[PDB]
């Protein structure tokens, strides 16, 4: 204030008062407080797996029993990453791969009727959410709005990756039946792993009575 005469002691944020010609300082500082997956991407980057192993080695043996159980179980995953695994920063996505089109197609059925792989509406939903997030940052970012949209974005990533883990997303108010996710196609009744073992139809074949 005044160019050097006054200097605010306490930590806080600045208010400039134009009438009574004063400056207020309300309790705060840069509090680097984050929410959502953006926070956890950092917490994985900032991680010393070597140290966490050397650390976990000590909580393992030295604290008495009935406590080291969770330390062992926690040591397995750290020791798994340190081996021929990878860095955990990867465990959160900022790039979503799109499956090729012909594996989950769109077709034109009785002249004017279509059939749709549920993945395609799950992929559209995420293109929706991601694009609205972009435009909401350019057009001003009132936080609780940007946070709703990011929540919607995680919810639609969890959607096309794996439904039924958080309550399932439906197509319309008529076929209230979970959309088939990237997880459904790699397990279950037919899936990808099982169906090859389970047996397919066969061209050069026949029946008759014997």
């Amino acid at each position: 204030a005044d160019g050097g005469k006054v200097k605010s002691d306490v930590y806080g944020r600045v208010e400039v008062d134009l009438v009574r010609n004063v400056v207020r300082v309300v309790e705060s500082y840069d509090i680097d407080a984050r929410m959502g997956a953006e926070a956890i991407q950092q917490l994985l980057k900032e991680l010393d797996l070597e140290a966490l192993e050397k650390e976990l080695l000590e909580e393992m043996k030295h604290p008495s029993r009935a406590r080291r159980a969770k330390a062992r179980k926690r040591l397995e995953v750290v020791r798994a990453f340190l081996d021929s695994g990878n860095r955990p920063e990867w465990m959160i996505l900022e790039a979503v791969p799109v499956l090729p089109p012909d594996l989950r197609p769109m077709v034109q059925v009785d002249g004017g009727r279509f059939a749709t792989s549920d993945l395609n509406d799950l992929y559209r939903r995420l293109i929706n959410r991601n694009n609205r997030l972009k435009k909401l940052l350019a057009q001003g970012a009132p936080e609780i709005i940007i946070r709703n949209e990011k929540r919607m974005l995680q919810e639609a990533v969890d959607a096309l990756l794996d439904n039924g883990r958080r309550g399932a997303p439906v197509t319309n108010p008529g076929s209230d039946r979970p959309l088939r996710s990237l997880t459904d196609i790699l397990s279950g009744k037919q899936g990808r792993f099982r169906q090859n073992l389970l047996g397919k139809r066969v061209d050069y074949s026949g029946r008759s009575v014997i």
Binding site: V26, R34, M35, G36, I40, R74, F81
Partner: protein, 105 residues
């Protein structure tokens, strides 16, 4: 999944601290957050929007005045914990009173 992969790697009981923060707007501190609360910097720890709003906005507060009463607006400089501001206007938040919108001058 059945063993938390991130929740066992990162340090948070593996179950709720996650569910709480990824999906909602709840928060963990990262890095130095100097400011006060019932303790100093909580390097790794979580909090609500309630106590996060008391660390970003501060401790504002609103106290209504029926159209005609005014006790100590001239005390537009200072206030204590639980102070009288009008017949039926107490103020437990401890701070500095401040004129919002005048009527009579």
């Amino acid at each position: 999944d059945v063993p938390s992969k991130i929740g066992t790697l990162l340090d948070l009981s593996a179950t709720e601290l996650e569910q709480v923060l990824y999906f909602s707007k709840y928060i963990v501190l990262d890095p130095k957050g100097a400011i006060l609360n019932g303790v100093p910097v909580e390097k790794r720890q979580l909090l609500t929007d309630e106590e996060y709003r008391e660390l970003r906005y501060g401790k504002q507060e609103t106290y209504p005045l029926p159209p005609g009463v005014d006790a100590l607006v001239k005390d537009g400089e200072e206030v204590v914990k639980g102070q009288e501001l009008a017949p039926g206007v107490v103020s437990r938040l401890d701070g500095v009173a401040l004129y919002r919108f005048p009527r009579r001058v």
